[PDB]
Structures are given as structure tokens and as C-alpha cells.
Amino acid sequence: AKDIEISASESKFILEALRQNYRLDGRSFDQFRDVEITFGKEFGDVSVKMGNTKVHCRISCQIAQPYEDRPFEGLFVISTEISPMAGSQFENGNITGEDEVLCSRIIEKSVRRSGALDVEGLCIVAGSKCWAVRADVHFLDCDGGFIDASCIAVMAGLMHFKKPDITVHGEQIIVHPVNEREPVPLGILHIPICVTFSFFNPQDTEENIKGETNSEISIIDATLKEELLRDGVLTVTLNKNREVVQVSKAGGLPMDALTLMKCCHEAYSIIEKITDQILQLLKEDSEKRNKYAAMLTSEN
């Protein structure tokens, strides 16, 4: 594929800066990027921005029939297809690459598998008709942190989305339009948030395997340049209920167990601030839509 050429000078500089408690963007080692959440006109339309990183998620649903195995559960899928828009490093439709499959699996284990969405409440008539919720993530601009950005984009979208109200007459489904009656929100059991840690070995492999004192550097939410020069990755997902949704350190630089535990506790402070942030932006968005609805009726 198309490679990103990194000079020895750039490799040595960024690593040496870390040895001097410096990162290029001026952040701290434990500092998460400021997350900006923008909602569109339609429900389920959400735009997440972390520095230069830009992702967009769109929640949609349509009437479908549940699987034979699960007659009481609705359908839910998450799409995260990459495109050259985020950078020429990504091949169009490359859904089998190492980083792609990992990212796809992290999100799936954080939202799908974790049961963040109440799929039981997606059923209209058992074993016949149900809702099929779809989360489409669009990677617009890549500056690292695509996993953390996606997990927030999916969750913010699901919590913002509203499906058309339905009254049931036996098997006859009466789908009320938004013009008739208001749409119905989705059921969220918990709010999973991902925090990704990047590891750097300031020395050599020998001192990592048999070295007495540990000296490996770990930073939170790395940018693209920091992401291309790391030796190991850790993605930990938690919620406000003080529970670990999932942890994934798929190989890479061997890291001390206590250090990995420290990361999990550090991530918990971040996911708390992020979750409350999402909720507040959802309230204000609701207050904004209601205030306009009052100004539209008054003028009507």
C-alpha cells in the first residue's frame, strides 16, 4: 500500500521530546484531547471532533425481520469503512487490514457485545417484525484516536437518535410519521467510552525484556505522528458505573501490569468527564429544539 515515510530525525526527535516530558501538540502525557460534539438537524446525526481528528456518525433504522435464533431481539450493526478521505494511507474498502479489523472489533465489543443498546426493545412483534438499527461511522480526517472518536460518535448518535412511533394492531404495523406523533428514543443500558493509550520504549528491547527498572513511556490519546512511532497500544473501555467494558492490548511493547492498571484508573477519570459532557450537550440540544418548536407554534 501507500506508506508514510518517517525520517530518522523525526523518529529521534519525537521520542527524545517524550524523554523530556514534551509532546508536540503541547498536551500532557495524561491529557485527553478536547472532544467537540455537534448534532445535525436530523436525529442520529452527530459530528465528533478531537483536535484535527474528524469523525461523523449517522444512526438509521428500518423495519426488518429478526433472526430465527433470536425472535425477541432486533438487529444492530456498526459500520466503520475507511476511505482515502482520511488520508491516502488508507486503501478504499480495506476491511481486512490489521488496524482496521482491530478498530472494528474494539467498537463491536464496546457497543454491540457490551449490550449498550437495548436490542430487546427493538422488537415490534416477536419472531416477525422488528427494528434494524444501523450505526454508520464516517472517518473524515485522521489525526489519531479513531477508536475513541468512533465510540463517542456511535454512543452520542444512539442517545440522540429517535425512531418513529409505532402502534400495533395484531401484525398490522402502523408507523406514525414525525408529522403525526413524535418519534421514540432508543434504550441505552450503559454508556461505554474508549480511551486509548500509546506506549513508547525510550531504550532498547533488551532493557524491556530483562531490564530491572521500568522506563516505558505511556501517553493518552496520541496524534497521528505519535501513533506512527509507538511500540504498543492499549484500548480500555469503561462507564460511569465503575466497570471495565473491555480491555484490548493486542500484543506490542510488553508493559508492566501495574502500569496497565494505572491506565485503567486514569481512563476512568476521563470517561466520567466525557459521559457527563455528552449528556449536557444532549440536554441543550433538546432545549434548543423545544425552544424553536415554541417559537414556531407561536408564529404559527
Partner: protein, 135 residues
């Protein structure tokens, strides 16, 4: 792209109205002397619809071939005969009970629709809308 353009232009030119694909389902009962008879309604509960598929094999390509695919599809659609469809009068297969965590539910009885081996009705094409291709 050819598949799409064929699909869209059939929808845009309004060749096939949904009403022309509605299945006028009949009923097959067991008459006297141990025989099966099928009674079809005319000019008048579950409802079915026909779905048309098409396979277009192009051999010996020598240039732009969309126009040939469309004209062939048009000629083919004018020969389409829809098979009569019927259901058994009282098929033994009824609702299927599925249990939840305390509460019970019943999946609706699925009726197996069967096509007639011989009897068929012609496809109702808006012949006024059938266009032919040229480039």
C-alpha cells in the same frame, strides 16, 4: 452500473405498477372422491406480491452494451407470464409458541404460498411507457 440503470429506468419510465404484481391468491381444498381443487377469486387478510428477477448474459461484446440489454429486457418483459398462486385451505401448521422469561408469545402462522403448475396470467405492462434504447 448497467444493472442499476436498468433497474432505475424501469422505475422512472413507470413500466411496472405495484398493482400489476399483486398476487390474487386462491385456495386449494380437498373435494369429494379424494381430489384437490383450487378456487381463484376475481375482481374484488394476508396479501402477497410478485417479485421479478432477471439474468442478462452478454456474449461477444463489441462496444457500449447497455442499449442492447435494455431492448432485450423490454422484449422479455412483454413475454412474462405470472404463475397462479394459492394456499392450502386449512394447513395443519398453525402458530408457534415461543416462551420468554415468564411471559409467553406466539409467532404468527406462516402460510406456505404455492404456485400453479400450469395456470398463469400475463404481466400487466403499461405498453404506452415501453421505451427502446439507442445511442
Amino acid at each position: 452500473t448497467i444493472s442499476q440503470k436498468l433497474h432505475d429506468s424501469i422505475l422512472h419510465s413507470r413500466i411496472l405498477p405495484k398493482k400489476a404484481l399483486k398476487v390474487k391468491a386462491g385456495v386449494r381444498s380437498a373435494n369429494e372422491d379424494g381430489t384437490f381443487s383450487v378456487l381463484y377469486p376475481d375482481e374484488l387478510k394476508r396479501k402477497w406480491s410478485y417479485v421479478l428477477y432477471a439474468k442478462i448474459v452478454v456474449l461477444s461484446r463489441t462496444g457500449p452494451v447497455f442499449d442492447l440489454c435494455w431492448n432485450s429486457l423490454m422484449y422479455a418483459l412483454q413475454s412474462v407470464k405470472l404463475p397462479r398462486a394459492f394456499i392450502d385451505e386449512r394447513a395443519s401448521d398453525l402458530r408457534m409458541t415461543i416462551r420468554t422469561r415468564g411471559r409467553s408469545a406466539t409467532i404468527r402462522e406462516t402460510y406456505e404460498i404455492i404456485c400453479d403448475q400450469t395456470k398463469s396470467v400475463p404481466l400487466m405492462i403499461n405498453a404506452k411507457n415501453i421505451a427502446f434504447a439507442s445511442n
